[PDB]
């Protein structure tokens, strides 16, 4: 899809592996903010989204946390607390024809900038210091959308670039999509290293005696110490205590 009407698709309830992406697309840029890709194969996420569109080749940078330009003012903008990854691969072999590919356009004139992650597709003619031209174009009153007209001879920075963005939370909300890693039989009453659905720590696991309400997934004592957790396979509630220590 074009930038001014980017498309979003929710992907959840499945086993995601981010090792197959290296295949497709030479991947001129594949970078993440808030996670590092080699470790990305491990954690479990809340809800991962995928947005796809085509933009010019000097604007890829505009898709970044809180960067100003003209591709992230009224076109598409991501938040300042973004977490996730951005991906781009120069595709000048399937989207650029001879004479201008007048198939992808972007809003050049906007009244007010847009909040993160909203897209506007209304076609309206810009104003010119007077009741806006009702269908025509004067000094101003330009058409909101201007075609890119991609051609196969431009400099690389003007050739189009397909881009796709993944964005997901990590507050450990009910895991809906995890990496491949397999399960292991449970051990109780022994100081053991545990990895519960992404939450890593050490301590002794004991059958719990506190009543988790059915919509809850974690338990906390004072000071953010994860005090209890429910098993992601059998749903029995478990208590965590750090193994014995003291001074000598």
């Amino acid at each position, epitope marked *: *899809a074009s930038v001014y009407a980017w*498309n979003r*698709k929710r992907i959840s309830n499945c086993v995601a592996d981010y090792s197959v992406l290296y295949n497709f697309a030479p991947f001129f840029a594949f970078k993440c903010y808030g996670v590092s890709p080699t470790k990305l194969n491990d954690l479990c996420f809340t809800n991962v989204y995928a947005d796809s569109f085509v933009i010019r080749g000097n604007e890829v940078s505009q898709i970044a946390p809180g960067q100003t330009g003209n591709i992230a003012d009224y076109n598409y903008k991501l938040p300042d607390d973004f977490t996730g990854c951005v991906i781009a691969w120069n595709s000048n*072999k*399937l989207d650029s*024809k*001879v*004479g201008g*590919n*007048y*198939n992808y*356009r972007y809003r050049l004139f906007r009244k007010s900038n847009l909040k993160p992650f909203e897209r506007d597709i209304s076609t309206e003619i810009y104003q010119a210091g007077n009741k806006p031209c009702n269908g025509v174009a004067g000094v101003n009153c330009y058409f909101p959308l201007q*075609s890119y007209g991609f051609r*196969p001879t431009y400099g690389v920075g003007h050739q189009p670039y397909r881009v796709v963005v993944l964005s997901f939370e990590l507050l450990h909300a009910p895991a809906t999509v995890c990496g491949p890693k397999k399960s292991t039989n449970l051990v109780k009453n022994k100081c053991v290293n545990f990895n519960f659905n992404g939450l890593t720590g050490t301590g002794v696991l004991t059958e719990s005696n506190k009543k988790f309400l059915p919509f809850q997934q974690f338990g906390r004592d004072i000071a953010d110490t994860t005090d209890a957790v429910r098993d992601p396979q059998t749903l029995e509630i478990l208590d965590i205590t750090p193994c014995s220590f003291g001074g000598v």
Partner: antibody
Amino acid sequence: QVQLVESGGGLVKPGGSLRLSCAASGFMISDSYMNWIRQPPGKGLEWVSYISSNGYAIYYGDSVKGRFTISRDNAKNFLYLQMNSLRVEDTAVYYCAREQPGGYYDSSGYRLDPWGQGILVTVSS
Amino acid sequence: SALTQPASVSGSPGQSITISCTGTSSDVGGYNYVSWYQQHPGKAPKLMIYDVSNRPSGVSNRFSGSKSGNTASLTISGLQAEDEADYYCSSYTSSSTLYVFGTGTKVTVL
């Protein structure tokens, strides 16, 4: 199931003009990329023009360039092809065909599946 | 820039046929988007294969497309009766003009 019936062709004189109508049935012509295929008598097929779904990308055949305007009536839900300033070498049959991968996540190359019934045009004295 | 498709072929029920379809290094070679259509007399030409190995619905497995470098080649097995029809190899290109066509093949069975 999905039919593409044509209307508006027939005999004509050189110099005049004409209008072709492509009527889509079985699906919505307002969101499916189209393009016409003409076939002269006793030869293969040939590309004519192409409309996008957007409506903002239009690609004509190189010989009919400068003429043979195209548009869509999303009100009457048809396709119209007006042949303007015809010449003698343009006598042929014409087909109105729809591109298959009109979804948004197809991962499959293009292929013209639903064809138009097709009408012939004859331009001479 | 047009595809070169041969005239006609002939064989008896039980045999299998092939047909060559060349092109340049911009339409067939370099994009692998090529397709093949069939035409009985008096009907709009119908798709036989596209995406060479991608055989579409209804089509009898008897057809087998393949693309090597620039040349393309179809292979039809099990000579039946409906074969009486024209066959056109088409391709998606990248300069102006988005589709070119082959001369057309006549497949007749004895």
